[PDB]
Symmetry: C2
């Protein structure tokens, strides 16, 4: 009966599945659930494990160089994730690549471009932080730590290794969402795409746009996973996209496709498919006005990435 | 007269030419306007005909003759729009990124070159964004004050696009113009203190950083440098300019200091600058900043105070 905990923490316990000497833990599988699902299949139920059951669990963790876009799906149930590590992973999913490269370089006095187990522990705790009423009345090892630093914690973590860990995690979650809609096929429909974007938006706007795609001319092909992932990378750098659309000033004008494509490239480095861009415009234009309005688009997308996970 | 905002109050204060009703800075007047507090002779415009102005322009150096001494060599034989005063001010104050943004944005036709007509429109964009920043600022002022009580050719245009305006301006060229202008102004400040020598002193530096900051706090720092142990070598112009480049990236420096961890040491500060900007200061440069600002509080520098002095310095 805990009214004493914050929103995020409440959630963590809600999905967590392991208790070991009093502490709670997600599995890898629980974490993917936590960032894909609204509520768990089994809520607030902790299987208790021995210190050894846990060690044993851990000893079959792959080394960092066998990491992949399928690390978590492969580990599934047999692994441990701390609540701090949960917030760390959420940061890797939601925030832009920049802050990580900066903070890692900042902690790499000793390295170089390598980090110690202890340095990583502190760096990760940093990311976590980010009277009148009287008057009225009167450390434990986890999959990530073994993965990054080996079994007795003595390895050092290269920056490029860790950076591709970040990429892998991002691609895993994206693949899971994309599969959700594709049931294994190569592409997804305009409607699938739209539903993914608008899924976390006010149901008024979602009404208009979804009926726009359902009523519109049929698509010729679908969105590959690559166009999908490109688009969500762009969602990580939405801030600079807005920034860039500002100096392409001045009247909050509306953007055409070649315009919008150029804007994406310049502000983020990514070169969208002509097809991906066209698909954006079919979702959102609603013939307003054969060109897209950037500040409406920025609004819904602002919402989508943050509250999607 | 009194109908005008701060910025053009100055433009007219330093302007020197009237041609068919419009006012203009020389290159010289612009350097003054950005380096000294008042003009030598104020609000006096010698009037010119379009044909005099034209001829004045006809001896404008081509783009490939630019340098960190372009404006000085132009002297008074040149013309600068009020719009262009603001554009050049933007070049001096804002971070490079935004310029790469809008040039890349207008370079459908180029590529990576821009047309004269494209440049004119882009420049008009930078103007309207300045206009209503100031206009909304002033309306905001008078609003709370109420709450309490109740096309023509130019030095730049010929320089960038030739004499009949038909060349295209390459990106490498324009970015190097930006750089040259910035080092011109810096070199002038540095001369101001060096009277021609190779270095300026710790106290010179300190005075330069603090000169446009509230005089209480500046006082404490200046007496710190005056009382402390003597400098061994003083700072070269190269360290000087490096430091002002770094001040253009102050925002990213702050963010670097936020996600890092207000107790910062010299090795910290060195790394922080490097991470946030690519630049590696001399050990001497870092040491001198610390001698000026620490006031032995306490061999550590105060992160949010220093950022404060420097917001002030740059704006």
């Amino acid at each position: 009966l805990d009214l004493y905990a914050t929103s995020r923490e409440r959630r963590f316990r809600l999905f967590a599945s392991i208790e070991c000497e009093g502490q709670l833990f997600m599995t890898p599988y629980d974490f993917i659930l936590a960032v894909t699902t609204d509520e768990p299949k089994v809520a607030k139920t902790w299987k208790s494990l021995s210190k050894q059951e846990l060690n044993q669990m851990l000893a079959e963790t792959p080394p960092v160089w066998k990491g992949s876009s399928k690390l978590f799906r492969n580990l599934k149930e047999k692994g441990v994730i701390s609540y701090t590590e949960y917030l760390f992973l959420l940061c890797i999913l939601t925030k832009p690549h920049a802050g990580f490269r900066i903070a890692f370089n900042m902690f790499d006095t000793d390295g170089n471009e390598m980090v110690d187990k202890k340095e990583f522990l502190v760096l990760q705790e940093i990311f976590r932080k980010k009277a009148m009423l009287r008057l009225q009345l009167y450390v434990t090892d986890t999959t990530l730590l073994v993965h990054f630093f080996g079994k007795k914690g003595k390895a050092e973590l290269n920056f490029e290794d860790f950076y591709r860990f970040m990429d892998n995690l991002q691609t895993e979650v994206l693949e899971i969402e994309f599969l959700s809609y594709s049931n294994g096929m190569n592409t997804i429909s305009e409607e699938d795409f739209a539903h993914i974007l608008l899924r976390y938006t006010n149901v008024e706007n979602t009404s208009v746009f979804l009926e726009n795609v359902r009523y519109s001319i049929p698509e010729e092909k679908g969105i590959t996973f690559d166009e999908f992932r490109s688009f969500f990378q762009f969602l990580n750098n939405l801030e600079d996209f807005a920034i860039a659309l500002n100096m392409y000033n001045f009247a909050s004008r509306s953007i055409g496709q070649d315009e919008f494509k150029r804007a994406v490239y310049v502000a983020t480095g990514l070169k969208f498919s002509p097809h991906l861009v066209n698909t954006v415009f079919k979702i959102f234009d609603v013939d307003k006005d054969d060109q897209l309005s950037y500040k409406e688009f920025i609004g819904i997308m602002k919402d989508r990435l943050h509250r999607g996970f």
